[model samples]
Target chain A: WTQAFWKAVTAEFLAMLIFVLLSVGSTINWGGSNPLPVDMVLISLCFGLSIATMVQCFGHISGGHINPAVTVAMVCTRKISIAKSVFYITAQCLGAIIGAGILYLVTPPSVVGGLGVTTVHGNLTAGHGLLVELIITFQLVFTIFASCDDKRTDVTGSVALAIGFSVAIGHLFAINYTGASMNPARSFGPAVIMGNWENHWIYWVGPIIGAVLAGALYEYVFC
Target chain B: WTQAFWKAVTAEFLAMLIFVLLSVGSTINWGGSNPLPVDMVLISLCFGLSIATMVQCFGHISGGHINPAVTVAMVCTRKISIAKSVFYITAQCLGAIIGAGILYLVTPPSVVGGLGVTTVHGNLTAGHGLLVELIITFQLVFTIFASCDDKRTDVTGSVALAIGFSVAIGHLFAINYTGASMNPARSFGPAVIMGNWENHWIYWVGPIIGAVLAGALYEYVFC
Candidate 1:
């Protein structure tokens, strides 16, 4: 492969690794009294800020798609080639795994709680979780397509911060529903590290579906 | 007075009304079975979006200094005349009252739990509440000054969205502790509407102190 292509792939891996490391670390029980209500905000900030920081740093290099959902959205929109999309997504997953494993290695056994892995919460059924994930991820991919489109400048602001807050808003609303995993790589990292595959399919399926819809709608109608 | 000044004052009133009306309404029990954990996300989104939307529309007109915290920050930085700052803050507070009253008039009595007014929660003494409020509001005012300064192009993004997320992030973390009133006008709105002034001084003092610090530090040091 060309050096340009390889560099981009490597950037995705590095960015995703940093993103998952700090964001997931924010959630480790840290010997707190079993998940205080305050922890939600802390986790939300870390997740949002990591992506924001990563994108600002390597966005031009790898398109800074630390999330597989954004890459899938690009593929659906033909902004990225399918072969390249596959590489980006693969790097993202790999990066997230190492990131999560780093946390697992460093964190004390007593402080580990869910290893910050996501799952369906409360009396909600699997379907509820799926729907919420779909809705939230749709919001994320839609914003990514809308804000980062260099073709126009309607509400142009910081692309990095915009995408980051979209992620945060989803978490704020859906953390209880589906752990708010808008990105499959984000979900896969914790799932793989914690050996918790429960409801894992929803993270992949919902985000892919959301990305497809967002890519099509933004590309077709709303442009 | 110049037309520019008058228009900015009226814009502040209109924007504040819409902001308080929608943001506060988001927290209505809405006949749900008490408050679900999911409700926090809903409330956070509404509050964040309202300010984001308002600022985008009238930012040029009023500088979109929608919160007294923001206005006070600008005053401290000598960005605006102290006279204009006083008018903006007055209009903001009045606009918030009308906004909260509008919600009161529409929503039924039984569904109105605290009218979405913020207060110290649980075992947090007033000092704990003040500290949290101070920390969160500092994050908000600091973001505002950094984002809107027309000086440099560092991490430039949507000023409206950036500030809105700062507010939302504060709520996500400190809502249970001090109801996360980063803006005195936001706190004053529901407090005045519900006639509940309990622990209200902290809301004003915490945000003002935070604003002065953010304004001074960003102006003096972060150049």
Candidate 2:
């Protein structure tokens, strides 16, 4: 592999580590001494800002695919080679695990109660979860393409912010359903460390399906 | 003016319109069935994202100085000519007025009963409100400089997002103090319609002072 390829992979890993840690950390602290929604908004912005900032800082090196779903979707759309895609996905998952592990150590069990695992909320069935994930992924991937495409040079500088906000906005609604797993690696990290596998497969299956569908739809029609 | 200058002015106007409409609309719909914070988060995201997206969309044309303070700062820094800065600020105010007018028309009076005016909450003194606005503006302008400067090109793509999120995060705290008037134009539009001028000077004075200070400080020390 070329040096540029590895540089990108390393940036993705590090960015994902910060993104997942800060995101999950906010979830863990949501009901703490701070009031409701304060932490959520702060956390959501942190995730978006961190993603955008890191991508800008690292995009030259790694294309900044911190999310496994983003990596997989890129591959599906032929944006990245399959071999490099696998490498990115591996890096993303490993980074997520490390992030989750760090969060676990920093947070108290009493506050976390358990790691902020994605779960179906408010009578949301697995099917509903899937549907929500699909729509959320659709918006996210659309923004990703819209923002990141070099042809869209008009918005090249703002892609990171646009993509990041799109994800945060999706979570605003989808957090009520399946905790909004648009990124498989995000789901994988918490699920693994928390040792709670209930509906674990839903996260993987749902996000992958959503992302791949989004990638195909965007590439063939939406774009 | 050069063709590029006109393009920048057009972009700035469009971005200001987006910022004003979304920001005021969110405030008007503050408590619509959804959780207030959720609504705020969604709306705030829209405001920030719109700016980021539009700047990307129009930055090439206008430098995307959607805010008056930004135009003023750029003029002071000699990054833009005085004639262009005056035109940009005029366009921003006009865009803001038009945006607020639209929000006024679409939204029900009952929904906008408060008209989303900026005011000190909880018997907080005007001094406190001024201080809060000053601080918020300080952080915002600082982020803006950090994001836009050529030296910070490594993170330039993320600057819009970074600035947007920083604004939202500032709102999280400042909202409780003074309804968060980090922008003079943001405060002026609603105040004009409401015919409520109580402590209005603080909003204008605080933000301008903060923006000017930030511009001077970042340029000399941080940059």
- Which candidate achieves the best DockQ against the true structure? 2
TM-score of each model, in listed order: 0.59, 0.54
The DockQ figures for the candidates are 0.09, 0.11
The C-alpha lDDT values of all candidates are 0.77, 0.69
Per-candidate TM-score, chain A? 0.94, 0.90
> What stretches of model 1 exceed 4 Å from their correct place?
A1-46, A49-157, A162-223, B32-38, B154-156
Docking class of 1: incorrect
With a 3 Å backbone cut-off (N, CA, C), the pairs that clash in candidate 2 are A8-A62, A154-B56, A155-B56, B8-B61, B8-B62
Worst 10 residues of 2 chain B by lDDT: B29-38
| Range of the 10 consecutive residues with the lowest summed lDDT in candidate 2 chain A | A32-41
- Model 2, B35-148: lDDT tens digits are 344455555664566555545444545676677666676777678888877887777777777767655654443344455778876798878888888888889888888777
Provide the clashing-pair count of each candidate structure.
4, 5
- How do the residues A39-127 of candidate 1 rate in per-residue lDDT, one tens digit apiece? 57667865795577566545656787888887888888888888989898889999999877765654445335676677887778887
Model 1, C-alpha of A82: deviation from truth (Å): 37
The superposed Cα distance between candidate 1 and the true structure at residue A175, in angstroms, equals: 9.8
Local error of candidate 2 at B201, Å?
35
